[PDB]
């Protein structure tokens, strides 16, 4: 059924079921591992709005959860605290055990509102939402995560194979061609956002208007 | 497409066993300073094929999770191992 | 006693893999139209013995669940498999 990857002579192969190995003795299980991977490696437009475009909502489907043992650093983590504009929550709480993605570089924390037509928040292409050593089909309320995927692997019997910035936002529409965005520096000072703006550029703007108020 | 041949990761020290007494919780760290942070600069196209592999694997993975009632799966690799055993025995 | 030799069931498509892109959740069905609905008209006394078998199995099954603290068991068949392995190896 499911694929699985191997490491023979420090390089890669692939085999579902039928490809024998009279070589890989599979000495134990600690070499057998499962690995997450972020999509930043694929190099998508990792701005804020496309995220909203890369996602969606619906209902009738549950959440599901899975375990991996290791992943990748995050140049763009994401957390959300959103309510429907009536005042009710969009998202469900994060259950016990789950915690934010531990190892971030730019936490794109957000609040805002919008019609959350759907009691859960899936990825559009069917990606994951990568928490501490865990993935989901969906997002949980008020918790850091990252986008990524998973693979499963075998290893041979030789070896094994920090600031955490905060960033804030506001927005509306939120799953719409009318979706709005804003960037925080202060209580009051905000700005209309563009896809151009990087974390570094906005971090720089924590000096410009940080001086000019 | 784009692909980062380099890689930097955050494994756990499940073993390695470079351990004194800090294994105890009460005197141990909370949740951090615990994940080893290993780097990598090996074969470049290796990891590109790897990222590819994961992106492909996603499909059957979702079908699997869809195809149960479990919330928090933990039983995959054990199942794969025993499958391999049968496939050899 | 009474026994329905016919049978009609609701399996899942755990595999079968007649899959396009609907494997994704966001564009997939909710929880229905997902279970295959296979029919059966094979040997008649087969399924009667089968129903019998389940009714017998109930006993040890309850003893097992009684004999743990787990709520939501999922580990049976893996245990049976590995038992068979030992029984052969």
């Amino acid at each position: 059924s499911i694929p699985l990857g191997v490491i023979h002579n420090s390089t890669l192969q692939v085999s579902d079921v039928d490809k024998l190995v009279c070589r890989d003795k599979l000495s134990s299980t600690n070499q057998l591992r499962s690995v997450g991977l972020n999509l930043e490696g694929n190099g998508v437009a990792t701005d804020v709005p496309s995220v909203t475009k890369r996602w969606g909502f619906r209902s009738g489907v549950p959440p599901k959860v899975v375990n991996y043992e290791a992943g990748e650093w995050a140049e763009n983590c994401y957390n959300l605290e959103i309510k429907k504009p009536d005042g009710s929550e969009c998202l469900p709480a994060a259950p016990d055990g789950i915690r934010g993605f531990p190892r971030c570089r730019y936490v794109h924390k957000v609040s805002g509102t919008g019609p959350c037509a759907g009691d859960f928040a899936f990825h559009k292409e069917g990606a994951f939402f990568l928490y501490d050593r865990l993935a989901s089909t969906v997002i949980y309320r008020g918790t850091t995560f990252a986008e990524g995927v998973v693979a499963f692997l075998i290893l041979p019997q030789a070896k094994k194979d920090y600031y955490s910035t905060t960033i804030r936002y506001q927005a509306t529409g939120f799953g719409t061609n009318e979706t709005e965005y804003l960037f925080e520096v202060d209580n009051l000072t905000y700005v209309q956002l563009e896809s151009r703006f990087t974390p570094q550029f906005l971090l720089q703007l924590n000096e410009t208007i940080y001086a000019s108020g | 497409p784009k692909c980062n041949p380099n890689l930097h990761f955050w494994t756990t020290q499940d073993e390695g066993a470079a351990i004194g007494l800090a294994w105890i919780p009460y005197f141990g760290p909370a949740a951090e300073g615990i994940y080893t942070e290993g780097l990598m600069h090996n074969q470049d196209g290796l990891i590109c094929g790897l990222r590819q592999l994961a992106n492909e694997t996603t499909q059957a993975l979702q079908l699997f999770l869809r195809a149960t009632t479990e919330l928090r799966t933990f039983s995959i690799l054990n199942r794969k191992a025993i499958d391999f055993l049968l496939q050899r025995w | 006693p009474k026994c329905n030799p016919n049978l009609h069931f609701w399996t899942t498509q755990d595999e079968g893999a007649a899959i396009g892109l609907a494997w994704i959740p966001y564009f997939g069905p909710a929880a229905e139209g997902i279970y295959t609905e296979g029919l059966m008209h094979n040997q008649d006394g087969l399924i009667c013995g089968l129903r019998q078998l389940a009714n017998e199995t109930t006993q040890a099954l309850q003893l097992f669940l009684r004999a743990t603290t787990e709520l939501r068991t999922f580990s049976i068949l893996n245990r049976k498999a590995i038992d068979f392995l030992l029984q052969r190896w």
């Epitope: 694929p3 699985l4 692939v14 085999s15 579902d16 | 497409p1 094929g49 590819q52 592999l53 992106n55 492909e56 694997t57 499909q59 059957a60 | 007649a18 899959i19 396009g20 892109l21 609907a22 564009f27 139209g33």
Partner: antibody, heavy 121, light 106 residues
Framework: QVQLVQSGVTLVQPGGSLRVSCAAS????????MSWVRQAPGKGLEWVSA????????YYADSVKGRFTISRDNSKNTLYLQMNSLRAEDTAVYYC???????????????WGQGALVTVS | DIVLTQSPSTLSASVGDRVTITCRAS??????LAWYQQKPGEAPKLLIS???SLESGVPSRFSGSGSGTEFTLTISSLQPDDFATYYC????????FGGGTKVEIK
């Protein structure tokens, strides 16, 4: 650039067998997946089976499950297909076809091989 | 498990006209549909991905749309080259085809 090479045609008796080989060039043969579709004369199309971009995942139509065995070779920039136990219905033009998308998604096909009008008697 | 329905079966029409073709299914589908062309002997060609995303190197006359089960394909200002046979490839749950759609002149 994308240069499929559908092999020539051969007659095989009923119940026989065959190994097709479609070759390709013009891109990264590994980054994309392939498949097979058939068209009997005076007929429409019919998907046969498909493969991952690397060979892990296979997918077969129900009508030919087990009868046909797909395979490729990334190193040789080559596709294959092993088949057996063949009936008369299998008489058709089998095409090696490439996807639009990349990385073993997007079953919808970009290119089309030349086809080979396989026969049974 | 799913089945399509090309409609009309064909057409016998002339240049410059505009034509739409329909394509139905037994079950609801998103914008995960495609279109093709091929001629009596020719290897086929792709036209649209997702039911609206036109392909490269194709005239802009080619256009279609829909959602759920009903799906369209509208082309104005026809040509001789446009008079191939066309097809409608599901790829939601299984890469399904159907009866195809032929074109000709009076």
């Amino acid at each position: 650039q994308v240069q499929l090479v559908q092999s020539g045609v051969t007659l095989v008796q009923p119940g026989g067998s065959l190994r097709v080989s479609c070759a390709a060039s013009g891109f990264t043969f590994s980054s994309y997946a392939m498949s097979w579709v058939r068209q009997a004369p005076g007929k429409g199309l019919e998907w046969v089976s498909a493969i991952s971009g690397l060979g892990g995942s296979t997918y077969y139509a129900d009508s030919v499950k087990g009868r046909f065995t797909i395979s490729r070779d990334n190193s040789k920039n080559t596709l294959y297909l092993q088949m057996n136990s063949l009936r008369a219905e299998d008489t058709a033009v089998y095409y090696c076809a490439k996807d639009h998308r990349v990385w073993a998604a997007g079953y919808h096909f970009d290119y089309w091989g030349q086809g080979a009008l396989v026969t049974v008697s | 498990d799913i089945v399509l329905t090309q409609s009309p079966s064909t057409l016998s029409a002339s240049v410059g006209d505009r034509v739409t073709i329909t394509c139905r299914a037994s079950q609801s589908i998103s914008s995960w549909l495609a279109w093709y062309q091929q001629k009596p002997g020719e290897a086929p060609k792709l036209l649209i991905s997702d039911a609206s995303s036109l392909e490269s190197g194709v005239p802009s006359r080619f256009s279609g749309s829909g959602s759920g089960t009903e799906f369209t394909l509208t082309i104005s200002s026809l040509q001789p080259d446009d008079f191939a046979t066309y097809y409608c490839q599901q790829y939601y749950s299984s890469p399904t085809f159907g009866g195809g759609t032929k074109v000709e002149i009076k």
